[PDB]
Amino acid sequence: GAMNSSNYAELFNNDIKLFVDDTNVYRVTVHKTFEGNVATKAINGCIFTLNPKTGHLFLKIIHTSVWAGQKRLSQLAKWKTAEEVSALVRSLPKEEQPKQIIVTRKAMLDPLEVHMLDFPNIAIRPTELRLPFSAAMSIDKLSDVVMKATEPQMVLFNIYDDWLDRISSYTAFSRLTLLLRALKTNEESAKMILLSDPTITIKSYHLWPSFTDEQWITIESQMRDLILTEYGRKYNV
Amino acid sequence: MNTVPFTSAPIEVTIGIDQYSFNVKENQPFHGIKDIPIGHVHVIHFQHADNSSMRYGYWFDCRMGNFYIQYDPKDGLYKMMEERDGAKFENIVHNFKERQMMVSYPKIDEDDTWYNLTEFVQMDKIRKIVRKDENQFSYVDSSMTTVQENELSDPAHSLNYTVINFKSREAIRPGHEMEDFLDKSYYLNTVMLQGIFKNSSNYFGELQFAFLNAMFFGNYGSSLQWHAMIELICSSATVPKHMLDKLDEILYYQIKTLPEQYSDILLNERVWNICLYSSFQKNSLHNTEKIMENKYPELL
Numbered sequence: 222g223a224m225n226s227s228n229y230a231e232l233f234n235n236d237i238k239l240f241v242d243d244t245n246v247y248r249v250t251v252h253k254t255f256e257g258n259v260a261t262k263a264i265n266g267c268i269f270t271l272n273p274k275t276g277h278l279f280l281k282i283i284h285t286s287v288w289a290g291q292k293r294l295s296q297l298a299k300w301k302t303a304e305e306v307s308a309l310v311r312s313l314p315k316e317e318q319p320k321q322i323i324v325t326r327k328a329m330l331d332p333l334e335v336h337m338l339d340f341p342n343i344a345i346r347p348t349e350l351r352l353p354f355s356a357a358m359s360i361d362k363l364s365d366v367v368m369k370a371t372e373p374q375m376v377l378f379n380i381y382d383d384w385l386d387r388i389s390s391y392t393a394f395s396r397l398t399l400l401l402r403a404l405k406t407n408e409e410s411a412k413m414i415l416l417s418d419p420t421i422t423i424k425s426y427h428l429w430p431s432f433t434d435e436q437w438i439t440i441e442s443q444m445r446d447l448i449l450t451e452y453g454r455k456y457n458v
Numbered sequence: 459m460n461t462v463p464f465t466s467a468p469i470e471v472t473i474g475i476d477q478y479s480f481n482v483k484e485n486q487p488f489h490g491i492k493d494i495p496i497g498h499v500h501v502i503h504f505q506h507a508d509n510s511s512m513r514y515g516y517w518f519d520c521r522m523g524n525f526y527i528q529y530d531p532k533d534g535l536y537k538m539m540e541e542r543d544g545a546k547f548e549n550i551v552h553n554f555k556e557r558q559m560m561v562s563y564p565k566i567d568e569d570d571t572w573y574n575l576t577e578f579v580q581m582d583k584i585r586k587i588v589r590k591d592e593n594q595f596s597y598v599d600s601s602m603t604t605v606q607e608n609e610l611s612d613p614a615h616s617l618n619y620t621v622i623n624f625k626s627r628e629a630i631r632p633g634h635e636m637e638d639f640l641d642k643s644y645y646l647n648t649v650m651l652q653g654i655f656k657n658s659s660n661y662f663g664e665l666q667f668a669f670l671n672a673m674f675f676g677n678y679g680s681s682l683q684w685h686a687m688i689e690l691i692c693s694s695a696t697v698p699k700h701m702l703d704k705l706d707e708i709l710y711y712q713i714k715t716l717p718e719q720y721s722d723i724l725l726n727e728r729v730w731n732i733c734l735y736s737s738f739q740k741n742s743l744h745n746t747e748k749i750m751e752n753k754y755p756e757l758l
């Protein structure tokens with residue numbers, strides 16, 4: 222059924238699964254109009270689908286042109302998300318199709334289930350976790366590719382860079398969510414932390430800096446301080 | 459006017475005839491029911507005093523033969539049977555009518571309740587779902603399950619209601635996923651109306667049938683089916699105007715007749731607040747919404 226802290230390690234077993242986050246598919250800026258009214262302007266977005274065991278991110282870019290002449294875009298975005306994920310599964314060879322698909326927001330269960338009627342053997346599940354995946358557009362390389370795109374586009378990334386060479390999926394995912402929780406609670410500081418030292422670089426084929434093991438522990442520590450902090454500055458404790 | 463004679467009443471039972479019911483005491487001299495209006499289906503049903511578990515019942519139409527009731531002490535129930543010997547039947551009935559051992563189906567002449575509850579209920583059509591074809595009448599009880607209930611375990615004793623499923627390939631055209639799920643006009647009209655029932659009278663019949671089994675027997679799957687068929691219409695942007703108006707009337711009498719103390723279990727909040735306030739047909743069920751709000755405002 223639902224996914225929560227009890228059944229947390231299921232993600233790293235050898236059943237293929239994908240997380241799907243739809244938070245950034247429909248993105249607007251809200252402005253005033255010459256007559257003094259308000260209007261939105263859509264910007265490009267994306268569907269964030271992730272295999273938590275491999276790190277593979279399938280990043281489907283949603284070009285504003287999708288929305289042209291559409292009504293009820295918030296509700297349409299969820300159906301368009303389900304159509305893109307269904308198309309993604311249908312493209313993959315059978316041994317590569319997920320056995321589960323875990324949506325980060327319950328509103329996506331019905332729109333996805335209807336799109337995957339052809340896959341009665343793929344389980345569509347919700348989750349009780351407060352996962353930070355909306356912060357994924359706070360990763361510069363990801364935001365860049367999304368904002369520059371001029372047409373629909375699928376771009377593939379390993380959100381773990383080469384971490385799996387040295388650590389396990391369970392720890393790599395814990396690292397990624399700590400980094401995404403920090404970026405979400407205070408983007409400026411979180412970034413300051415990651416880049417303070419110019420000697421540490423981001424390889425062109427990676428998203429995150431090339432830290433050693435000991436640097437990552439120092440990094441992870443500071444990200445926990447931040448999240449505790451912002452919690453005080455937000456709850457006065 | 460027609461007659462259902464009983465052989466005897468060996469056990470204490472509450473007996474129902476359509477929307478009427480009366481108490482018969484163990485070995486009270488009772489020999490059945492008279493003056494049954496011809497021209498409608500009818501249902502006769504039973505709740506033993508000794509075990510309020512198991513409401514059970516027979517659907518029957520007097521034009522289709524001569525039918526009596528006879529307690530079976532092996533199997534423990536009032537059984538419906540057909541008398542094929544015509545002159546033996548007439549003679550039995552006359553003798554019991556003469557001795558006045560029968561209760562009169564008490565229809566008030568202003569009252570169209572039964573017809574309004576049964577307009578499109580047909581005996582050859584009920585037999586397409588309560589399969590028991592050696593008999594002209596059809597047995598239902600509280601605990602019988604539906605074909606779709608067994609898909610989620612005895613098929614001969616099932617209620618093969620038409621299968622409705624909103625997240626199904628039958629209900630969802632490929633490439634109109636969102637259009638078809640949010641607006642079920644194509645499921646309702648092409649798949650169900652044109653494809654299955656053939657017409658709305660048939661669709662309304664099954665729905666009327668669904669409700670009465672639910673109300674009379676507390677058959678849980680029957681009430682899932684009534685609610686489903688309601689929901690499919692309420693959730694379709696494009697419904698013939700004649701269908702919507704007839705539905706408003708049908709639901710209006712169903713609501714009016716429901717016992718005031720059985721509503722909590724027999725009415726589904728989600729379906730009704732959708733039908734009446736969110737769905738496409740929020741504006742179109744004027745009679746049913748007035749009676750729902752004055753009688754069961756609690757549900758809303």
Ligand SMILES: CC(=O)NNc1ccccc1
Binds near residue numbers: 579661663665
């Ligand atoms: C299934 C089928 O034959 N018709 N629908 C129906 C109509 C009236 C009574 C019972 C069912």
